[PDB]
Design a protein around this ligand. Structure first.
Ligand SMILES: O=C(NCCCN1CCOCC1)c1cc(-c2nn[nH]n2)ccn1
Ligand SMILES: [Cl-]
Ligand code: NI
Ligand SMILES: [Zn+2]
Length: 330
């Protein structure tokens, strides 16, 4: 079996290998990449996402979110407090101000130590899930706005015809901006491109051990767990690497730099944080291997995890027994 220890693998495709997205995902899986839950792809040197990031400051962040924590340094939840709209220009200036700027630090390890020690005592602000794309129209390989849609995959594999669209989203982050432990909706894949700015650190649990993380989260967040079996889909819970190690949870970590793609695989739980001002783009996608994960994915039906209208058809076709209850929760 390939990649039995479930290590995060890093790939360096040639321009020739970068010309067929689904073929290269399948190649990475033939080498065991999916067993880690996450892989890094470094594009060939000749490729570029866009020629210049001039004027990015004109994009509007309609509802910036302030991430307020509760709990202890290694085990906390975060809630989002809505802020007034700001442009990316205003947001970048805020990210770089004394209150929010990255602190002096020796290396990535020192910065990670500072994050887990101090995150709960600050409330960083970020822009999340902004529909849009920063790829140039003339970028033909790995353009997240021109990938095959999840609907077309489902129609090809199952012979069904469904409504819905699949479009990319932008994220603007700053030091300590945090993404909570989660898998994707319907346990889909995701792909994330870091367009500009400072790095993003990722943590990931192998899909074959995802239930261990779920059991620990129930133990550590008992009130939250009681409302909803699938409360990790609320995307509110953080658990540090030290606490994961104390409790025997298998995981890995890797840092993504500007110009690099990260792919998350079906049922790979992930979390992480930004080092400083940056801009990323992400979209969900599917392959034939995803279908059996989609059929078995847990659902939040308690109200909290309000989803996209695209997800209705996925539940309706793949999980008919669950559909009515899930709908009541929407
Ligand atoms: O999957 C993630 N977020 C949830 C997407 C919600 N769906 C459903 C609603 O429409 C947008 C897509 C995520 C975010 C980040 C991240 N990177 N920088 N900040 N956060 C990293 C890894 N995963
Ligand atoms: Cl700090
Ligand atoms: Ni994600
Ligand atoms: Zn719920």
């Amino acid at each position: 079996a390939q990649n039995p220890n479930c290590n995060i693998m890093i790939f360096h495709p040639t321009k020739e290998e970068f010309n067929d997205f689904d073929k290269y995902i399948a190649y990475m899986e033939s080498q065991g990449a999916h067993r880690a839950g996450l892989a890094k792809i470094i594009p060939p040197k000749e490729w570029k996402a866009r020629e210049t990031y001039d004027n990015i400051s004109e994009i509007l962040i309609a509802t910036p979110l302030q991430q307020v924590a509760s709990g202890r340094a290694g085990v906390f939840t975060q809630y989002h407090k809505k802020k007034k709209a700001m442009t990316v220009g205003e947001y970048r200036h805020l990210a770089n101000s004394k209150k929010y700027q990255t602190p002096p630090h020796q290396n990535f390890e020192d910065l990670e130590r500072k994050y887990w020690k101090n995150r709960i005592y600050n409330s960083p602000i970020y822009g999340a899930d902004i529909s849009g794309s920063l790829f140039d129209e003339n970028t033909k390989q790995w353009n997240l706005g021109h990938l095959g849609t999840i609907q077309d995959l489902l129609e090809k594999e199952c012979g069904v015809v469904i409504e819905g669209v699949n479009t990319p989203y932008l994220y603007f982050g700053m030091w300590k901006t945090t993404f909570a432990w989660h898998t994707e909706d319907m346990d889909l894949y995701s792909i994330n491109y870091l367009h500009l700015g400072e790095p993003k650190t990722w943590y990931v649990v192998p899909p074959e051990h995802g239930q261990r993380l779920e059991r620990l989260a129930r133990e550590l967040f008992p009130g939250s767990s009681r409302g909803c079996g699938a409360f990790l889909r609320h995307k509110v819970a953080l658990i540090s690497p030290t606490v994961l190690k104390e409790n025997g949870i298998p995981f890995n970590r890797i840092t993504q730099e500007a110009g690099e793609f990260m792919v998350t695989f079906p049922y790979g739980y992930h979390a992480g944080f930004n080092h400083g001002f940056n801009c990323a783009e992400a979209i969900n996608f599917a392959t034939p291997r995803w279908i059996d994960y989609g059929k078995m994915a847990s659902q939040c039906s308690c109200g909290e995890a309000r989803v996209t209208f695209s997800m209705d058809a996925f539940v309706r076709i793949l999980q008919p027994e669950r559909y009515d209850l899930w709908k009541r929760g929407q």
